[PDB]
Structures are given as C-alpha cells and as structure tokens.
C-alpha cells in the first residue's frame, strides 16, 4: 500500500492532492496528534475532502461508512466497487488514483542512520543468500547504500544509491521516484556485475528477532526515540499482501451472520460447520495448541457457535469483552444462567458453577447434543472483564494471570480442540490475546534462551484472520506482556 503516507500533516496532503493529484486522487493519513486516528483525504471538485478513521482497538471506524479490518481492505472495498462512500448529502466519493508515497521509513529493508560498520556486522551474523538492506550514507549526506549478501566464499557487496534532484539511481540507467521504486526494480531485475555474480534481493535483513532472555533491552530502544511506531507501521505496510479471498462471507445467505459486514473470515482458514448452513465468522489459527478467533456472537448465530465448539471438540472459551461496551452491543449472552440448562438448537449447555476472580469470571459449562446419550464435554468459559473500553490495560500482569490459568486448563484436558477466543469483531483484543499466548508458549517450552519474533508472529497469524492485532498500543502491549513474563522467572 503506497497510498499510505506515515509522516505528513493535514496541510501537506491538501497541497499534495492539489499539486500532484487530479480528481479521484486519494491518500491515507495518520493524524500525528492522536495515535489510532487516521484520515482518508480525497481530491474532488478542486478541493480535498478529509474522511476520518478511528481505531479504538477493535476495528477501523469509517465516519459515515462501515467498519473494516485493515486499511487495505477499506480502500479495496471502495475502489473495487464504488457507490457506498458518500458525503451523506447524497454526493458520492470516488477512489481512483492512489497518491504514491516516497517515504521509505516503513519498509522492511530501510534502516536510516545505520552506519556501514554495523551494517556489515549485521549481514555477517544474520544474513542469508539474498539478505539486503538500505541505509543512509554517512560519507555523502543525502545518498544511500544498498548492501547485499550472496553466498569462506560468502560475500557482502555494496551498491551506492545516489540522490539527484529527488530522484534515485544506482550509478547509471534509470532514475526512480522513490527508494522503493528502485528496490522493487532490482528485486525483480537483479543487478549483475562484471564477473557474473547476481546481486539477488530475496528477503530483507531480519532485525526484529530476539533471544527471549534479552528482550528488556530491546524494549528500551523501542520505547522512546518512536521505535515502537517505526516497527508497527513497518508491519502495517505488509497487510496489502494478506488480501485473501473472503467470498464465503460476502454472500447474501451469510450476511446476517457477521456482526460487522466487512470483517469477514478468510476462505482458507474459515471454520466450516457440517450437520444441518456451513458458515460462521471464525478462523483456525496455529503457529501443540490451536485457536479459533470468532466474532461476538449474534443472536441469530448462537446455535451455530455451539455447533462449532462441539465439532472442533473445544474445551476452553476465552471471552475478552463485556456484553455491552461504549453504548453498542458487542456480544450476545450465549451461556445459560448459573445452575441452569438451556438448549441452543441441537446443542445443550448447562452452567454448573461460576467462579468470580479479580480480573475475570470463570464458568464451568457442560456441552451435550440432543439425541445422543452420554455426550461429555466440559467447556470452560473464561470471561475477562477488566479490559478497558478504549486502549489496552496499563499493566500486563492482569492478562498474564488470566492467560496462564487458561493454558493450564487446556493442557489438563486430554486431547482438547482449539482454544476459542472472541471479543467484539474478533481481530483486535483476540488478536492481542492469541499472539501473547503463542509467544509465551515458546518461552514455556524451549526455555528463556529461545528466539522470539513479535512482528513475524503477528503476520503469521494475520495470514489466517484479517487484521489480527489492531493498534500500536496493542502491539506495544504484546512486548510488555512478554517482558513481564520473563521478569517473573
Ligand atoms: C515489522 C518489521 N520491521 C523491521 N524493521 C526495519 C526498519 C527499522 C529498522 N527502521 C525498524 C524495524 C524489520 C527488519 O527485520 N522486519 C519487520 C518484520 C518482521 C517479521 C515479519 C514482517 Cl511482515 C515484518 Cl515487516
């Protein structure tokens, strides 16, 4: 996504759409003031119309429109079929020409002030055949250096990128608009030098990996001058690669089964139901223990929800939201009252005992099917209630206490299905919950001296359900959650 400009103000996007843009030219904007606030500035009738987007933690809220999982799915929803983005006076908005950005800040291969001695050291210890990165030049203030490793017959070559009148080149041939256009060009058409060595640009140099023991020192660098914002928005510009097909949720017979019409499961990980429709807004997740990220249950999908728990042999349910938050409704009461028995379609649930903790409340439910005798299943529902309406908790210890108890219950039950996690839309809070549980389980097995990768773990999960982990505060909270886990060991 090149229509996203991470480091501009509201006035510049106005100037840019009025100078280098025609009608239909749009542009994405993060409001520098408030993190979690974005703007969709569209040029129309010689003026720029600013459409505000707010992400409290659960979804991207378009003002006057609908709710979307990512900003890529938002732009795709309006570009691919127009006629739904209106100024609500009746006049419609058109998204036709993405204003491309030249800022390389949030690219995998960009490192900025990274010198040449550290860059040579980094590629020697972490680079493979094809690793590369781009850095600012120290000798010539303004230029850039591309260092590539190809492989003691392993080498690290250096290609000097010169900047001439806001245009970049490698010494000869074409001159490009941005560093990205230069990198994307030689990533596809490799640079061959005199003696027949191809300078292959396979994957950028990995710097996000961490030996799990020394993570507190990485949080130090990331914390202030923002390293966390630099890493998150770098992760955010890879969401345009995860636009997999969501056709099963976009059809009429399934529209009233999604709490939010434009937050839909991927077809390749959706949980299909069998005994009867097959559709539920749910996705299987796995890096052993698996997960199922569901939405807040709608009244018309409660029976489908309990069908899924039975079919996947789930024994643990993680509720990371209240029933009513911020005015609207986010989850329907899908469990019977204490000591009560209710029938949900062919399914049957008995709430035998409720246990109130400080952060959460636990419900021991008994799930059985109508007709078949002696259907066991003790489903344990963990309802987290200390999560705030806006943002993330200020202390990771509350969730970590909640999550360690859930893991022990899962391991206690011999051969248990995936752990069901759900909030409002089932992408933000649950995305933060599932990622935290994935990272801790690695440090729970291989020990303290293992290697974790928060950005790689998130995109691995983001490939199975749209927009897992929503905000930078959720991204930062994941780091704080892992750090607090090490300090207790
Ligand atoms: C999010 C991220 N950020 C990086 N950087 C580069 C620019 C910086 C040094 N300024 C800040 C950190 C790097 C590089 O290893 N990888 C990632 C990543 C790691 C795993 C998966 C994915 Cl999908 C990404 Cl995108």
Curated annotation (Swiss-Prot):
Domain free text: The SH2 domains repress phosphatase activity. Binding of these domains to phosphotyrosine-containing proteins relieves this auto-inhibition, possibly by inducing a conformational change in the enzyme.
Reaction(s) this enzyme catalyzes, per UniProt: O-phospho-L-tyrosyl-[protein] + H2O = L-tyrosyl-[protein] + phosphate
Name of this chain's protein: Tyrosine-protein phosphatase non-receptor type 11
Family assignment from sequence similarity: Belongs to the protein-tyrosine phosphatase family. Non-receptor class 2 subfamily.
Family annotation (InterPro entries): Prot-tyrosine_phosphatase-like, PTP_cat, SH2, SH2_dom_sf, Tyr_Pase_AS, Tyr_Pase_cat, Tyr_Pase_dom, Tyr_Pase_non-rcpt_typ-6/11
Organism encoding this protein: Homo sapiens (Human)
Annotated EC: 3.1.3.48
Post-translational modification summary for this protein: Phosphorylated upon activation of the receptor-type kinase FLT3. Phosphorylated upon activation of the receptor-type kinase PDGFRA. Phosphorylated by activated PDGFRB.
Positions of the Tyrosine-protein phosphatase domain: 228-481
Keyword list, A-Z: Acetylation, Cytoplasm, Deafness, Disease variant, Hydrolase, Nucleus, Phosphoprotein, Protein phosphatase, Repeat, SH2 domain
GO molecular function: cadherin binding; cell adhesion molecule binding; insulin receptor binding; molecular adaptor activity; non-membrane spanning protein tyrosine phosphatase activity; peptide hormone receptor binding; phosphoprotein phosphatase activity; phosphotyrosine residue binding
Record note on what altering residue 73 to K does: In JMML; increases protein tyrosine phosphatase activity against CDC73
Outcome of mutating residue 467 to R: In NS1 and JMML; JMML patient also shows growth retardation and pulmonic stenosis
Reported effect, residue 470 to P: In LPRD1; does not affect subcellular location; decreases protein tyrosine phosphatase activity against CDC73
Subcellular compartments: Cytoplasm; Nucleus
Tissues where this protein is expressed: Widely expressed, with highest levels in heart, brain, and skeletal muscle.
Annotated effect of mutating residue 73 to A: In JMML; also in myelodysplastic syndrome
Binding site for substrate: 389, 423-429, 470
One GO term describing the cellular component: protein-containing complex
Annotated disorder: LEOPARD syndrome 1: A disorder characterized by lentigines, electrocardiographic conduction abnormalities, ocular hypertelorism, pulmonic stenosis, abnormalities of genitalia, retardation of growth, and sensorineural deafness.
